[PDB]
Design a protein around this ligand. Structure first.
Ligand code: 8YM
Lengths: 205, 213
């Protein structure tokens, strides 16, 4: 009644887009450490129960396509959908290998009006960057926005540690709030959660 | 499943805190903005909801941009040492990133910046709540929460706002026993299935926020 329904066959798909290397025309540096971030995210979100797939050094057209196809799959037997973006990024925009893609554009494939099979289900985007309305049920968690080369992103280690420890007994906003705290206190900038959720989200039934 | 309750915000203070309501109904003609019929009724419900919670509520009306900037700056300079939190509620016309005074637009970011950690030493580690109905070493930005009436928004000349009616209902039933994100989530659901619009919460809180004990 007050939780998103989790009585589904699978938890859902998790697309991790991992961008380490960038083109000539972009002029942005190798993000040393994401292979430690993405690998940790893979275990976290896998241990949660997501069908995780990692995609490396994506173009904008590829990210767009990758997400468009994802949105076009059938999610009837899924509880939710997760996308994780590791890249560079200016305000309101993310980076492929071959330029810039707006984050609005990636998410738009999943709005209530374009992906009937995810309607009334959580759509979760995690971004770290160096009768029903169409915007309901999205959540964004940004990190801002700094990456360590040997340990990873302050944000990723906290999110992963907390998820391994409390992924099954804490609501999504609790988990994220404790991530906000650990990033501010232990490692100076803070993450940001944007929530259009309409129920509590637990990763268990 | 369900939960009960050093992960919470400290509530052991004399006062819960200030709650500043800005009720902009009437705009200079040169702005081309129209009277916001219904907003008096919103500001009333809000004043009662927040007083009932424990807030020292103050209501300002038909404010200019300089007035809005000044009363916020001065509030940021008061001594909040004995308050658990702070709240501001903006009712006005709005556009992307901006809010309307009676005479113009002013960036929402400039209004909230007065309360950053480096500029308001006495609300440090304390939640700073901003509720915006705009019909279209510590990180300095920590412990802010923004609850906007819509994503980057209607109202009823006779019934009031959607958001406010919902927010205020949920605050009376559950304001003293639900966590702030639990409350705001339920408001989201009600503005969604009670009536073509969805509110939007931006949280940088570092703890859970309960308005009690
Ligand atoms: C970017 C953002 O989320 C934001 C939305 C509205 C108003 C100001 C902002 S910026 C911000 C965010 C958190 C804490 C303090 C501030 C500030 O510096 O006033």
């Amino acid at each position: 009644t007050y939780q998103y329904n989790m009585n589904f066959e699978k938890l859902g798909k998790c697309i991790i887009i991992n961008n380490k290397n960038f083109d000539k025309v972009t002029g942005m540096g190798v993000r040393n450490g994401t292979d430690k971030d993405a690998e940790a995210l893979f275990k976290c979100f896998r241990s949660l129960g997501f069908d995780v797939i990692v995609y490396n050094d994506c173009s904008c057209a590829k990210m767009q396509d990758l997400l468009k196809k994802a949105s076009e799959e059938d999610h009837t037997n899924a509880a939710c959908f997760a996308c994780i973006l590791l890249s560079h990024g200016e305000e309101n925009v993310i980076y492929g290998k071959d330029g810039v893609t707006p984050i609005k554009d990636l998410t738009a494939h999943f709005r209530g009006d374009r992906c009937k099979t995810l309607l009334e289900k959580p759509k979760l985007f995690f971004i770290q960057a160096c009768k029903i309305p169409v915007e309901a049920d999205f959540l964004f968690a940004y990190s801002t926005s700094w990456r360590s080369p040997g340990r990873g992103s302050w944000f990723v280690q906290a999110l992963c540690s907390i998820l391994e420890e409390h992924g099954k007994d804490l609501e999504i906003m609790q988990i994220l709030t404790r991530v906000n705290d650990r990033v501010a206190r232990h490692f100076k900038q803070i993450p940001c959660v944007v929530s259009m959720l309409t129920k509590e989200l637990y990763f268990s039934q």
